[PDB]
């Protein structure tokens, strides 16, 4: 009578896994995206006699840090980081966040933004002089040349804050930015200092890293697992009916 | 949870939305039309 609940848990968590996979597939064109991993954990129920009931719980263990494919766009402000490297932005709630989106934009007032989040430099958020032409070097250095002026007068303005962090040290926040895990925060500090060993390419944008093969295989597996759980539910549903209706 | 094993935790996304479409302000090429009324701009400037 309670195997129906085990099968129902399996089917519901299969639905959750399918939702995760569909959300990953919907962002196949999102610039600088990290796919969410999915794994079904097994929770064994601990009673006294025979733990013959073990349930299923869907989980998302971090994300995927494999870089995607770089689109070469003839623009100086689109940048791509090294493998396992992160650009730093000031988060929505006045905090710090890390990202791979190298689509740096400028405003009328001259401040650099990523998705609307101001970028964080050595001295705080980076502000470029109003209406200047901007070039980004291979180590984060930013040069600004005023329009209609000799290129000789170009001068550096600041340096981007580029950090290095692996998947174990990084957890996705609800606003799409990545942050440090508590266990990584305890060791590497609240704020990560700039890592000078990371090279950055200017003029190339990093796309998403969702793998179509894994997504399609996961969808097929989810469908089949759901059908099996429905069969288990149906088998349990007939037996209980007969039993009660007759042994009364 | 409080932490070997894999960091447990169900975190589900929502989808994808388009925020803003941006135009690439890069200098295009020049084509020769002998009409004296046509002018091309070498740089970032707009006729008002």
């Amino acid at each position: 009578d309670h195997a129906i609940y085990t099968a129902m848990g399996a089917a519901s968590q299969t639905l959750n896994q399918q939702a995760v996979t569909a959300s990953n597939l919907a962002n196949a064109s999102t610039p600088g995206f990290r796919a969410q991993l999915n794994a079904l954990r097994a929770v064994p129920v601990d009673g006294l006699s025979l733990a013959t009931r073990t349930l299923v719980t869907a989980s998302t263990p971090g994300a995927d840090m494999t870089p995607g494919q770089l689109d070469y766009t003839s623009r100086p402000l689109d940048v791509a980081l090294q493998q396992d490297g992160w650009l730093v932005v000031q988060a929505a709630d006045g905090a710090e966040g890390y990202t791979r989106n190298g689509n740096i934009q400028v405003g009328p007032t001259g401040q650099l933004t990523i998705q609307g989040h101001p970028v964080i430099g050595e001295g705080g958020p980076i502000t470029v002089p109003e209406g200047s032409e901007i070039t980004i070097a291979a180590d984060g250095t930013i040069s600004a040349l005023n329009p209609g002026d000799p290129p000789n007068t170009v001068a550096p303005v600041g340096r981007l804050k580029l950090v290095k962090a692996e998947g174990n040290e990084v957890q996705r926040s609800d606003d799409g930015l990545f942050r440090l895990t508590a266990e990584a925060q305890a060791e590497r500090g609240a704020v990560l200092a700039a890592d000078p060993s990371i090279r950055i390419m200017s003029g190339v944008l990093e796309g998403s890293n969702v793998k179509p093969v894994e997504a399609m295989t996961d969808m097929i597996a989810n469908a089949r697992r759901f059908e099996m759980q429905m069969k288990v539910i149906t088998s349990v549903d007939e037996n209980e009916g007969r039993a009660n209706q007759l042994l009364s | 949870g409080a932490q070997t094993t894999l960091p447990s935790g169900l975190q589900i996304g929502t989808g994808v939305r388009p925020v803003a479409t941006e135009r690439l302000h890069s200098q295009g090429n020049l084509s020769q039309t002998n009409n004296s009324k046509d002018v091309a701009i070498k740089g970032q400037g707009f006729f008002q």
Binding site: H2, Y5, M8, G9, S12, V43, L55, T57 | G1, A2
Partner: peptide
């Protein structure tokens, strides 16, 4: 002490 019957109390609850 009873509780919510069915789906809520038969799905793996959060730790705390």
């Amino acid at each position: 002490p009873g509780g919510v019957p069915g789906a809520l109390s038969n799905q793996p609850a959060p730790p705390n």
